[PDB]
Amino acid sequence: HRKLIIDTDCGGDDAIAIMLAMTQPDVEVIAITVVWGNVEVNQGMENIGKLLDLYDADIPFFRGAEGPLVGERETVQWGGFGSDGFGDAGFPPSQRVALQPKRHAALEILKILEEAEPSDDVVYQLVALGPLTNVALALRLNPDLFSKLGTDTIPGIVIMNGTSESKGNSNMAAEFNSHCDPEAGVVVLQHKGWKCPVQLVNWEVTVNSPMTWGFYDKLVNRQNKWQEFIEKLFQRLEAFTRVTCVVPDAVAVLVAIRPESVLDSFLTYVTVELHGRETRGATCIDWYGTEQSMAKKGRWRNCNVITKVDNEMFLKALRDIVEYVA
Amino acid sequence: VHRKLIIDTDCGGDDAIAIMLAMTQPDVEVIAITVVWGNVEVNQGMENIGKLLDLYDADIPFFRGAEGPLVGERETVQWGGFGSDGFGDAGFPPSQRVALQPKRHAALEILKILEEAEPSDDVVYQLVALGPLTNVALALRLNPDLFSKLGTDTIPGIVIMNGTSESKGNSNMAAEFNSHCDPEAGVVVLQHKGWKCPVQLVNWEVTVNSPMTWGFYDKLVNRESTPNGRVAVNQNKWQEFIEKLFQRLEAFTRVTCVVPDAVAVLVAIRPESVLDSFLTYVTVELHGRETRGATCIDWYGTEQSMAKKGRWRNCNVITKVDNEMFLKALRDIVEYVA
Amino acid sequence: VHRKLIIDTDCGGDDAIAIMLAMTQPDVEVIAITVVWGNVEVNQGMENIGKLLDLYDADIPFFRGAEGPLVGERETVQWGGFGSDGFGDAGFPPSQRVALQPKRHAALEILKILEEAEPSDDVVYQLVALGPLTNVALALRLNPDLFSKLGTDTIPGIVIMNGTSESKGNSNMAAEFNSHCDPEAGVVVLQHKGWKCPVQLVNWEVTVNSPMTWGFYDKLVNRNQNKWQEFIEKLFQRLEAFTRVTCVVPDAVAVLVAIRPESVLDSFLTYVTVELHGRETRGATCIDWYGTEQSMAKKGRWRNCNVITKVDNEMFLKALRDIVEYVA
Amino acid sequence: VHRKLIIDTDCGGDDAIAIMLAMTQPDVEVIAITVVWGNVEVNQGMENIGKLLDLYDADIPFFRGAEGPLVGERETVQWGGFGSDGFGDAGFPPSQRVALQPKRHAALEILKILEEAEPSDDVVYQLVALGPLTNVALALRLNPDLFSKLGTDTIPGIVIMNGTSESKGNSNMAAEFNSHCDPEAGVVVLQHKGWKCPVQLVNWEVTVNSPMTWGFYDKLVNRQNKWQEFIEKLFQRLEAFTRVTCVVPDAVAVLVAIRPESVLDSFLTYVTVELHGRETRGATCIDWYGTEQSMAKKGRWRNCNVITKVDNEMFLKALRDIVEYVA
Ligand SMILES: [Ca+2]
Ligand SMILES: [Ca+2]
Ligand SMILES: [Ca+2]
Ligand SMILES: [Ca+2]
């Protein structure tokens, strides 16, 4: 049984990803932590509330950082999902928002880790679907508790972050979440004491595991109440971009909870550039480094670069979202 | 007007003189000491603060903070001017106070103090930072709103010993130690929205400009001679401690002795000691090769040019401190009766 | 179309194969070889070119160029894959051609050749750069206008073995050797206004994707030799001992792209530049994958560079095969 | 000692006063003027030098140099303090000298001059740089060895108006214009091995500390002769824009080159230019506390004399000498 903390900036693919986690057996989302990114934290809170209304779930969700770990944001809000990142769909506003605790998301990660009881029946995982600010902030406050995540075998942290080929979608080199907070990425990747290397679910690997617009049409039944919500959520994205639809965060959640969906990967040293002009936020990957090269430069195999996900397993998981009975 | 201070510190020789100055001034109360990495490691820092509070018998609580920069490995080296422990290698008796202290991270303690703070016309809270800004930045990103509880519209909420005014760097060619230790933290502090008063930047050059003479020092610690020659004759426990604390620094460098952190504490509690300053936009360079940690100052920026760049006057660069008031405050340390 | 090539080079093992390729292809004539620092120092490079031209008894002139980057000390290290002289440590007889060469800096020679050139659609001049771009940048800064004499509206004037398309850096984590050697020079080349055709970027990954097999190599070198095969066996002997299923010969791929444009099976035309200021990414190749006409105009960007993504391996092997079968 | 100067310039208002100072001093001869981009474009610059030489009837040759930085697009803006042409928008008659000038790029002219230079104890050669260092850097990478012909063991071969001593940047927060214009070029000049004497750095703050008064200026232009009339016209926009003191930085640099006794204070140490900072690109980095052992450990040496005080009295007298010149 997996217990997940999902850290998110609450866009359309974040919603599909959360839906995937909540409709999979032997998985329980125990907290949702909101971070700035594609929409502002206040709007994010509203989005999560609307998504949890749909499920009637009593999962607690928390306000996190409104900007980067260090300095003004150097990225722009995309707007691909619409002005609220959620379809501008007219969902009824949620009464869940005001009920939520005041605790900063970072302090909540720590509280959950503190209260966590790892055994072989119950494993805890953090999946990060937005800029890493909340996670970095928690890490520098109490680094030790992060060893409670994962197993020697099961990854404690999976992140939707960076590139494997520096096809940047934010600047020329850097992926959005990474570019949003490069400092936070360094803190996550440099951290000592993960039980398993960070799993890097990067842009290119999600591009190569998309859904077809044809598949989408069938998903949304071109109706039970889940398909209706997905149609409304994706309506702006659909008008703006529609042969394939890339749903990155959902790929990340799939990697976390079905590790067999990883068909190919490369375990090596990875870090984030902080200081370049065109390359701030770039993912730097030691492709050729030997154990002897790394020792010399104080590197180590800290990151598993995911290079191929099983598309078939992904589609089935999406299919499972719309067939879910509580 | 009573001041309640939080002092964030990396626990070197000049940090000790600064805390001594805060603790011996009337209408001032140090309510918490938060320890940060810098010239000594946090563990050693804790031991230093404990030895300093033994001297006073003070029950001020102190807290372990960050062991390294906000982001990445330290890019500075430990100076060693005050000795291997940054505190004289003097054989002070180890303190029993250390083990008694609460486990709380220093950052969470700043937030707790701010949360419990009850500012009024008669009570003002101030944060004086005497080391790398890591703890402060960390507290700031967790709960930025609480920081408006510091200061008044008139009295500065934050005074930092940090940076340069002329980029005479003492860590690399351009950057001062504390700034260079954690440039990212400095950006967080200076870019923060909602300080009641601009950050007061007590920089390297203004502290160099307000030093003590070795001759003054000799009198501070009751060395005399004639007769015959230089020896301490009837030292109080404050002078004895100061003599032991500075003994390595003295052997390494000894006409003037610069005590930067003490100057910053003076600025915080006696604002009339600021003879000259320049209010403008200041930030810290994060990305240069030779200039990482540099203090960048908008010397010629107008209201118009700052508006167009998303700048504002966020920092008061202190350029002259009253040396006479500084010496008197040091004098007041050795004359203190509880 | 008769091609006249200027080959700028740091005179390593793959540089030699590349030059051999140019010199054994019909309707191609190498008219100058300009030497640049890189995997070997300029003096050693001069010696290498001399020994290669001895083999052919070619009277092609060759020139000393920059001994270091456009700006600052080198931030790369000499690889040593081809041996201590970058040329097999093979005991080739030293060349008498070296002392005969003109004193002219390589940069000023590029300018002289461009000045004397009569370009038409029958006779095209092409610069192929196989090393750090120092000499080219330096020439470009001094007389940028003359560089329009290279190429056609159809045929590329400049082809460079440079950069990555995927930031699999072989010098630091992100940057390829030639690019990391001189990132400033790379910006000068890619930012230059007035190329008739975009710069062709023969990057690391595309050359990795078009290698030779060690088996192919054994046949190339006949495994009763001829003089070309003997020289290739000796040139690659250290590389072979150090690394030997596939052998990557990047500079040869670049020369192939310059003289047989039909070997480019796939490419992407967009805006490309080189990072100057990153800590881990100095020398990185920055490629505008998603740039549109609207986004590029706002950013002062334009489609300046053709990123080569697949070369025809079959055409490549045939061209290497043609080296060892050459009769003057 | 007879001095032979090459003056590298971006042709603004203080560049003109500076060149006028060089041309009106005894035992000085300007033998070439090399034009570089900066406050005005090279084409405009050429026009300006031509108008200045018309005034003197001088047959000094001048050359077109770099239109932009050594590497990448300019990251600075044209100031416009001296007006739209950097020269007063004054209506000076256009010069017939421009079309006569050789086509040689300025960089290759520096090399030709150095190649033909004949140093002796009677004749010393100096390069004074009054703009972005692009031309000088470009000449240095092409043929570094020739640059040892400049100077003496005692007399500086290169004097530059460049950088800051206190990082009071007038282009960004940290950097001075010329330095910010071309940081890469500054590294090339400062890192060069083989100068006979350290580079003399005539920086922004020391020139601010040796200005002229507007009152002095009034007396200078006779508030009249052909020299004064020209100076009044050249400074007319600057005067309307800014007018107690008027800073004339390039003139201070020329003064330091030709009257070394005007340097009242300086500090010899290791200096370089930041290439990679966001806010500090173009900053002057100075090793204030470096020692002989500390510098050796880090591959540094004393490559640069940071000028910290110039004799204002000597400066004013030299300006005074401009308007009293008889050929
Ligand atoms: Ca997201
Ligand atoms: Ca301190
Ligand atoms: Ca090569
Ligand atoms: Ca000028």
Structural summary, described in words:
- The structure is a homotetramer.
- Chain A is α/β, with parallel strands linked by helices.
- Chain A has one domain (1-326): Inosine-uridine Nucleoside N-ribohydrolase, Chain A, CATH 3.90.245.10.
- Chain A contains 14 helices and twelve strands.
- The first copy, chain A, has helices at 12-22, 41-55, 96-99, 105-115, 133-141, 176-180, 182-190, 203-207, 213-219, 225-233, 235-241, 248-257, 291-296, 311-322; strands at 2-8, 27-34, 61-63, 123-128, 157-160, 198-201, 211-212, 244-245, 262-268, 270-272, 283-285, 303-309.
- In chain A, strands 3-2-1-4-5-6-12-9 form an eight-stranded mixed beta sheet, sandwiched between helices. Chain A has a two-stranded antiparallel ribbon with strand order 7-8.
- In chain A, strand 1 (2-8), helix 1 (12-22) and strand 2 form a beta-alpha-beta unit.
- The first copy, chain A, starts with a strand and ends with a helix.
- Chains in contact: A-B, A-C, B-D, C-D.
- Chain A binds chain C through residues 164-169, 171-173, 271, 273-280, 282, 284-288, and chain C through 165-170, 173-174, 273, 275-282, 284, 286-290.
- Bound molecules: calcium ion (4 copies).
List the topology elements:
The structure is a homotetramer.
Chain A: E1 2-8, H1 12-22, E2 27-34, H2 41-55, E3 61-63, H3 96-99, H4 105-115, E4 123-128, H5 133-141, E5 157-160, H6 176-180, H7 182-190, E6 198-201, H8 203-207, E7 211-212, H9 213-219, H10 225-233, H11 235-241, E8 244-245, H12 248-257, E9 262-268, E10 270-272, E11 283-285, H13 291-296, E12 303-309, H14 311-322
The structure holds calcium ion (4 copies).
Pfam family, one (chain C): IU_nuc_hydro
InterPro entries (chain C): Inosine/uridine_hydrolase_dom, IUN_hydrolase, Ribo_hydro-like
Keywords (chain C): Calcium, Glycosidase, Hydrolase, Metal-binding
